[PDB]
Design a protein around this ligand. Structure first.
Ligand SMILES: O=c1[nH][nH]c2c1SCc1ccccc1-2
Lengths: 273, 8
């Protein structure tokens, strides 16, 4: 009984991901998001610890949804004739990091450090759960404005994490690494680090560095804003052309630009209220 | 200059 247990509200968005509605769980008035996915528009399918065939996105959300984290939690889901419906957490108030950066411009490094740190913890969490997001970008990050917590969303391009080569990809091309542009192959962690380099430049400069394949494989990074040397070093390291030259997640979080990070509550109080 | 979203 789906329609008679969540009160459906206004459309939050639609696109290559589906159609996401605001909603309230009638049981306890909890804010929820209700996401619809047309069955015909699904590429990768999986099965859970029940054998029921479901979209990979549901598989991945279940693997990461255990406990608290900087990942959006899947509360429930239903099957319909031609669609699947996903019940997800909805922070309130909320704004995604793409709109936040558009409105504010290039973020102060203190704020970019707190945001980037939380994204690193969230991505580490996914990899710990055997999940590879494959579409890390500002558009897929929610800001709980009151708590100052970042939430990773939209696993519709993800895969189970593995150590062999990936030769398929349906994420955002401007956040994809040069080895995907040049050779249609990549490894999961090193490609994730590349997208995180794109993300960090986006935070400190006000937009992404590369728009075109030539720029991506060119691996030249021009800074259009005043950015500290330590932060430019971390960005250029993440965006090394050779995947093996990129830093590990440990090396990113041990980098000197990443020290003395603000707490989420401090980040809200200083930068978001 | 113009800043835009990018689909997938
Ligand atoms: O996969 C997703 N796409 N969009 C959203 C999700 S998870 C919940 C959410 C909450 C507020 C706004 C958008 C979204």
């Amino acid at each position: 009984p789906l329609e008679s247990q969540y009160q459906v509200g206004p459309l939050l968005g639609s696109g290559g991901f589906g159609s996401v509605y605001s909603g309230i769980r009638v049981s306890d008035n909890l804010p929820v998001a209700i996401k619809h996915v047309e069955k015909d528009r699904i590429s990768d399918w999986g099965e859970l610890p029940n054998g029921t065939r479901v979209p990979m996105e549901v598989v991945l959300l279940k693997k990461v949804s255990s406990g608290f984290s900087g990942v959006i939690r899947l509360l429930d889901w239903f099957e319909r004739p031609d669609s699947f419906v996903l019940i997800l957490e909805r922070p309130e108030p909320v704004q995604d990091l793409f709109d936040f950066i558009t409105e504010r411009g290039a973020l102060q490094e203190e704020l970019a450090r707190s945001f980037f740190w939380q994204v690193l913890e969230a991505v580490r969490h996914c990899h710990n759960c055997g999940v590879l997001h494959r579409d890390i970008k500002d558009e897929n990050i929610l800001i709980d404005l009151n708590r100052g917590e970042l939430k990773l969303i939209d696993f519709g391009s993800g895969a189970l994490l593995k150590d062999t080569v990936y030769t398929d990809f349906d994420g955002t091309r401007v956040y994809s690494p040069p080895e995907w542009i040049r050779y249609h192959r990549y490894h999961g962690r090193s490609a994730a680090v590349w997208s995180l380099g794109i993300l960090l430049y986006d935070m400190v400069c006000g937009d992404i560095p590369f728009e075109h394949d030539e720029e991506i494989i060119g691996g030249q990074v021009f800074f259009r804003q005043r950015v500290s040397s330590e932060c430019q070093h971390l960005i250029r390291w993440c965006l090394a052309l050779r995947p093996s030259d990129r830093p590990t997640f440990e090396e990113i979080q041990n980098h000197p630009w990443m020290q003395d990070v603000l707490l989420p509550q401090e980040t809200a109080e200083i930068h978001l209220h | 200059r113009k800043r835009r979203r990018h689909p997938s």
